[PDB]
Each structure stands twice: as structure tokens, then as C-alpha cells.
Amino acid sequence: RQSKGVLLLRTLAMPSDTNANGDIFGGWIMSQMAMGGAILAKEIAHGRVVTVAVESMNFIKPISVGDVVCCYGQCLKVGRSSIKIKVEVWVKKVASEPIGERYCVTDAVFTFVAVDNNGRSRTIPRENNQELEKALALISEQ
Amino acid sequence: KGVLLLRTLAMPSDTNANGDIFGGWIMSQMAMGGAILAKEIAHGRVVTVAVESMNFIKPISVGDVVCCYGQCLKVGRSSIKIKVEVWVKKVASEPIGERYCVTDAVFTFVAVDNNGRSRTIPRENNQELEKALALISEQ
Amino acid sequence: SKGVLLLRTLAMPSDTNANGDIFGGWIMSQMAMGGAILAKEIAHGRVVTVAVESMNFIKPISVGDVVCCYGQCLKVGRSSIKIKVEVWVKKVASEPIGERYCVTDAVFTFVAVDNNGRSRTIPRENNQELEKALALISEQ
Amino acid sequence: GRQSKGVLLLRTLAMPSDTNANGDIFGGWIMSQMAMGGAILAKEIAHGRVVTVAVESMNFIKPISVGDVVCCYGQCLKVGRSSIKIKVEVWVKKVASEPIGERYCVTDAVFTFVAVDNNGRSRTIPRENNQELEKALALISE
Amino acid sequence: RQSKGVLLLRTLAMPSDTNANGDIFGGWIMSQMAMGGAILAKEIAHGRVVTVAVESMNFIKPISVGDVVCCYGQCLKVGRSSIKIKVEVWVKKVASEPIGERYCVTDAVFTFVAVDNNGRTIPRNQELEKALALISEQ
Amino acid sequence: SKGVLLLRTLAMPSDTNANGDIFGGWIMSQMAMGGAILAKEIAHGRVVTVAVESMNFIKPISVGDVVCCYGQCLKVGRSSIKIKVEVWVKKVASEPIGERYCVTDAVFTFVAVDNNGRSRTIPRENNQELEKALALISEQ
């Protein structure tokens, strides 16, 4: 298994973000997915967005302190104002064993809505929008 | 809306660029509160395995009181499904006393042992489970 | 667990001290935040936190404990409110399970204020929050 | 003015992340600084671990603003066999905010610590060649 | 100017990481650089590392809340235990004007040392081969 | 010798790295904050960090260490301020008790700026913080 999507975010899992068991807190993972997913939505929307839904999330494997943590995004659908993005969280072992090992720890499907200054719905610009163009192209492949 | 899981104040450190509370913080509160109820029903450790139907309805503002409420929807051998609702109360901003649901979701937890292997939720001596099943029976 | 529930959360690793227990500062912060919510409720708006008295650190909090702050109002003045805050722990995923006890307490004083930070009178009319407060006072 | 009394315990800058809804620094942050500073002097006097057991008094006098320099000063008031009572004052200095140069006391508190062993049980503060204790008692004497 | 090195880290600049000027705190920027550079160092070292030196750091342009922040790294020299990495910090504007704008905001040169889990030499390891190749190129 | 005390705090577990020591990013953060305070005092206002040279990590910091930053201004320009920052620890609750040593140092450059982030001239008039710093530089 390999990642699908573009790289949204990349970071190191730190001790401050652990839970009682010593693994990384699920809340931190959700936040990383949220932040990452939103970057890609803002890119496509050419501006501000809000998250309106997360229809699914699956916590597959735990994350450990010291793991490199990447979030990949695949835009599934673009509406007049909405953007639906699948996010996968992947880890790479760089200083724990087995080194170089990579695997998918978490997934989710987020929905964002393009908004104005007042948080109110706005139409995603369709003209001269390369970021949208790229997404629509990958969607049209299935 | 079920039982009170968590309660706290919305703080400036947890804001987003728009200046509302960051959605990541909200999801983290829902997870923590839901897990507390799951652990109560399970009579010990749980892991979070899934979320479905998370809806962000309204923004949270700095200074809002934030409560998370939980209603257990199903209990399996090891799995617990809990609807978590996030509610805000205006105590020191207008309009004073106003309360409303801002976010909801359904979390699934699995009862686990010390090795992180699933364990059976005890049917014996478990009034937490008895309460959750009676509430489910009322729906 | 005496008085009304102000706050409830889980104790986390990031809030530990060098001994591995929960840092005293975090517990003080939870108390002040919970105490202030009830003061704001009672005051029907803004307050300021002006004093603390008789804070007692009884037992340590452990990572993974459920942490609850309870509030017992002791006095309501024109603008001042004194609240006893008790911090309680519940063991839900550590032994012994279902065990609860009081780990910290303190008395906070708040003052109801207007938008320009001047003191204001806590309304006695249509104030169910105060009514419930004065019932708490009914223990000395 | 009034001038600070005691020895410098802590010095830091008040930061945006530690603000309340009014935009001032949160009271819990100030309490935390006072406890940490107080505890350092207690440990210095006690020659090792202590635990905090009481705060008999705390007064929030004035607010702290983002970008204030914040200092905690400590005065040991009393030393028992294992206990140490310490008055903490919090002072601010304006360096990049108006009016520049102004200093004043914003917060005080009186803390009680107890010297403990590795197991968290009471221990006797060593008196023989304890130069930090000697220094504290000499100040208490006058 | 275009980015040099491989992508180390990518994040969003958040309000909690602001300074008293209202820009993003230099402390946070340095922390990103250290984290990102160490990742590449550990990749080449095939394990744990410590930071021993930062010989240079230059803060070129401020970072703003809501900016996308990327750290890129280029290994300059690999020794027996030592790894030297130039880090560049770049920002991309995605929901502030000018939208689409990218530019370099910070750079630094970090030195790392390969250590075991107490307190070693680098295996000769296709990370090292990619790094040494680029070095031989420049 | 050390210079003046910029900052003093306790190393906390929230600031640890994956090795269990204090994270180097936190140390760099303390140094930048403490050095900026001195720079701000001399500059009679706001500053920004523009450069670091010769940063050396000497020993690790441990949870529960007392951490102090000390500063010595080396040079003042029209708007720039060069400050050597040393980070020291003191053991107060871990062995060996009372031990103190330098764990990090660096040379920081700050630039005096206005409210729009543009460099400004450090005033020579009525500035005794500058006078103080140039006094020590005079000594070499």
C-alpha cells in the first residue's frame, strides 16, 4: 500500500501530544487532518474556508512519539462552494524500529465550504483557477 | 442530549485565523469527553476507532462556556457508540444565557486490555451499562 | 463532590510536573476558570477575579484521571461573590476503578463589573443562578 | 513609589497565547508563574524536592498585558523543620508598550511548601552548611 | 529565488504562535527549522541525532498567521557522525493577499551528530547516497 | 562575566523531545525572548530578531532544571543590537544539588522597528539603557 493524494502537511510527533497510554492523542491527529485538509481547500477555493462536516474518520494504527507524520489529500468533489477532501495520515519510522517503515495510520473525509470575510458562503472562482483545474482533472479520472 | 461529559471555557490560544475557535480543538474535546463515557461503561481502558457524521453547525467564540454531552447509541461485545453534542453558553457576552448546539458527531470506542487487545464490556455489576441500555430502550 | 459541577476534563501528559503528577499551576487554572464561570452566571455578566484564600493541595492528580471542579457559593455581596472550589478526581481507566476523591480546594472572590470595568450590582430579580447560589450558602 | 521585595525568582515575557477573553493575561498563567517561582526558592532553601501544600492568600491587583516583562520576586517568611512559607510578588515592566519604563506590582500571594524525599514524604531541611537557608533566616531575623 | 532542498516540514501558522508584535514568533520558526532539519539528519544517519550547532540563522521576512509554512533542507556535508544541513523556510499565501504568493522568509545552517539511544557512526544507506550525490553535484 | 539576567524559568515535561531531554527549539525560543527584552530596553521600544550566529548546544537540559538566560550587548548600530545570550542551568531538585553550568550560547541580532515593522533609530537622547550597554562595551 502506497499513499494517495498530495502532501498536505508534514511534522514530528512530540511528547506534549501524547495520551495516557503514551501514544499520540487522537485529537492531535484530527487537528493535523483538519489543518492539512483546509490548506488544500483554501488552495482550490482561492481563499477562506470553513469545515462543515467530517462524514467519516478511521483510526487504524497508533502514532508514536518521534514518528514523522504526513497528511495526504485527495479532492473527491467540488461544488459551487463545497470541497470534499479525503485525508490519509501516514507515519515514517526514522529513529524507532524498523527504520524506514511507512504505513497509513488514519483516514477521514472532510467537507469544507468557501466563505467570505463574514463566514458566509461564497462561490469558488472557476475562471483562471489552476488549483481547481488540477483537482477537477484528477476527479475526471476516477 | 444525554449526560455531561466535559465542560470548559473557550480560550484565545485555541483560535483559528478567522478568530473563531479552531475546529481541531472542538474535535479533541468531543473525543476526550466521549472517551470518558466509554471508559465508564467499559469499566476501564478504551481506544477510539471511528467517527461518523460530524457536523460543524455554528462557530465557537472566545469566552463561550463549552459543554460536551454524550448519548450512548449502541453497545456491542466490546464496542461503544456515543453521539457527542457540543453546546455553548453565553455567560459574559451577548446575548447572556443563550445556549445552543454548535457541533455533533458519533464516536466509536472499543474496550481494550493492557495489551490493547479488545475485551468484553462486563455485564456483571455494571450500572453504567444498565443506564445506557435503558436510555437506548427509550428510543 | 459538593456544590455544582463547574468543569470536567481529562488530565493529560502535557500538564505534568517533574514528578510526573499533574502540575499545581494547571489545577489552580482549572479552579479559577470554573469558579469564574459560576461567578459570571450568578452575576448575569462580566466579572473580575480579585482574590484567593485557603487553597489546599491535598493529593496529587495523575495522568488519565477525570478531573472535576465543583463550586459552593459562600457569600454574595452587592458586587462580590465568594466561591469555594473543590477539585475531584475519578478513576475510570486506572485502578481502583470508580474511586473518587477531593484533591484540592480554595476560596475565590470575584466582583461583578460593567463594560468599563466598574463594579455593578448583582441582580436579585429573575436570577435563578443566584437562588441556587444562596441554597449553597445554606451550609456553614 | 512602592519597590519590589525579595529575590528575583522568575522573569519572562507575557505572550498572546496566554491571554483571556478581555485580551489581558489569564489569571491561571499568573498563578502558575508564582507557583513555579515560589517552588524554586523553596527548593533552593530545602536543598532538594518540595511539594506545594497551601496558598493562604492571593491578590490580583492589576492586569498584565501582552508584551509586558513579568517578574516574580520572593521573600521567605518562615522556615519550619520541613515547611517553607514564601511571599511572592509579581511585577511588570513596560519595555515595548506604553508608557515605556513604567513598573508596578500586579499580583501577590503567600505560598507554603514542604520539603520531601523521592517518595514524596516529608524530610527535614538540612541546617548544616545550608547557605541558602542561612541567608533566608538572616532576612527573617530582621 | 526558488526553493532549494527537499521538503522537510509543512504546517499552518496559527494564532497561538504569535509574538507581541502580532507576527509569528521567531522561537516558533527556529523550532520548525530544528524539527525539519533533524528529520533529514535522522534519515541520513539511519537513527537518532542531536543538534550541536546552528552556525547561522537569518530572518528575512516575517511570517503571518494563516500562512502555509514549509521548511526545505539541503545536506551540505556528511562526516563520520556529523550531518550539516542548510534549512530554508518558505511561506505560501493561500487565504491572505496576495493569494498564491510564495517567498523565502528564513534560513539557517544546522549541524547534527548521530547518537545511539544513550549517547555512533553513519551506515554506508541510500539516504546517504542521495545526499552525497547532490553534494558531488554541488 | 555572564552579563545581565534576561530570563529565568523551570524546564517542564511539555517541552521535551523524543530523547526525553528538553527540546532544542524551546531553548532557542527562551534565548530569543530573553535577548529581545534587553534589545527592547536599549531600543526604547519594539524590536524584531534578524539573525543568530555561533549557536552552540553544550549539554542537554533536563526536566526540573532551573533555566536562566543571561545577556551581554556587544554592539549597537543605528537600529541594530547584537547580544550574546548564554543559557545556564541550576540543579535544585536533582543530583548534584546546586550545580550550575552553561548549556547553550549564541549571538543574536535584533533591529529596532516601529508599529509598521519598519526599522527605526535607537534614540541617543534620554536613553540610560543604551548608556549602560555602551559603558560595558567600552570595557572590552
Swiss-Prot record, chain B:
Residues 1-115 form the HotDog ACOT-type domain. CDD domains: BFIT_BACH. PROSITE patterns: HOTDOG_ACOT (PS51770). It is an enzyme of class 3 (hydrolase). Its EC number is 3.1.2.-. GO terms for molecular function: long-chain fatty acyl-CoA hydrolase activity. Disulfide bonds: none annotated. It comes from the Bacteria. Pfam families: 4HBT. Gene3D superfamilies: Hotdog Thioesterase. GO terms for cellular component: cytoplasm; cytosol. Keywords: Hydrolase. One of its GO terms (biological process) is acyl-CoA metabolic process. Belongs to the acyl coenzyme A hydrolase family. This is Uncharacterized acyl-CoA thioester hydrolase HI_0827. It comes from Haemophilus influenzae (strain ATCC 51907 / DSM 11121 / KW20 / Rd).
